[PDB]
Symmetry: C2
Subunit: 204 residues, 2 copies
Amino acid sequence: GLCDRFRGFYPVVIDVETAGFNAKTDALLEIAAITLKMDEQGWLMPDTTLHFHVEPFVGANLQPEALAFNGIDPNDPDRGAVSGYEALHEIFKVVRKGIKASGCNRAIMVAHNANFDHSFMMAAAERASLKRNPFHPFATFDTAALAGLALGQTVLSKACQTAGMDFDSTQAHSALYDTERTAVLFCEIVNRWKRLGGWPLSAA
Amino acid sequence: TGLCDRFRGFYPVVIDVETAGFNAKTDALLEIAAITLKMDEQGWLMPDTTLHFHVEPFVGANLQPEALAFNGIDPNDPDRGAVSGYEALHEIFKVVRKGIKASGCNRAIMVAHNANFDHSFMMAAAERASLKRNPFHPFATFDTAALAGLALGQTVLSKACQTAGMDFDSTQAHSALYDTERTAVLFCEIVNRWKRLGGWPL
Ligand SMILES: [Co+2]
Ligand SMILES: [Co+2]
């Protein structure tokens, strides 16, 4: 029922960490993705988590303030960084598999302040000349907006807390932790709508 | 009031734009409409004030025939009654600032369908017009395509409205005025429904 739930959209939770706000000039440094599934009773939950540290693309700009914010050291030899091509190709591939295996036709990014993460993902896919991009080129599910509606909060940490979730600022601004918190928040929001009887609308 | 408490000080304003292409930096803004919202005694959300403007293509703007065929707009119509981007935005920002003060919010947030698109065009037109004290938040938006996905399982405007039980007239679609009004009613219906089913207050 996953692909029935959003009319053929295959929701994938994404978070990105970067070296600035400029998607065309600034480095992509980190990306995590979480696919989702629906059980038999129609509840939504995380499926698979992918996480990559990303090497600054050749000639990339880097803003000191962004690095201070996310705490990432690009030259950290223990970072285990790969190219944007390698990271995005594997994320795209897992998503592409999920799509045709579930009956959806396109993936849609779920993210907190999604246009930020979406813009960076698209720019990096463009740089890497990745031909097959399973993600919708402009549509997103912004959890900041979704949390505004459901919890009256637009800030991730506060939203999770109000949602009755754990949240540790110590770990924030890290792709893996942020993506996982976002996935649980999204699932909680969707599941809660179902519990309240908001879903389904009618027979079907 | 209760409005400004509902979204932690954000003052939700519904926007829609018509353009001559998908590039917010280089393509002309052609139409813009704005609808502020209010909350009644029972705490239901509803439309307040409506503004609408036909916009003259800025000097040096590009024009995509496909976009113009779609929205039927002809930028060289003797009397589109068009005004400059500066004129439209100045008036909108003025009404919006008034709203913020009266209700006790501290910033405005754009409510639009596929909000990123409209938001980028609005910001570009503002820069272009060297306007300052833009009351709108520079990053945050309430995208009704995402909200309708959650609440209705539909991301397309016309489909989401119909699914919600509303009328959607294809004969009026793709006019800033008509689309903005449908977007506002859709957003109010979604917020109101969440409350109705006991999702709000917490
Ligand atoms: Co890259
Ligand atoms: Co203009």
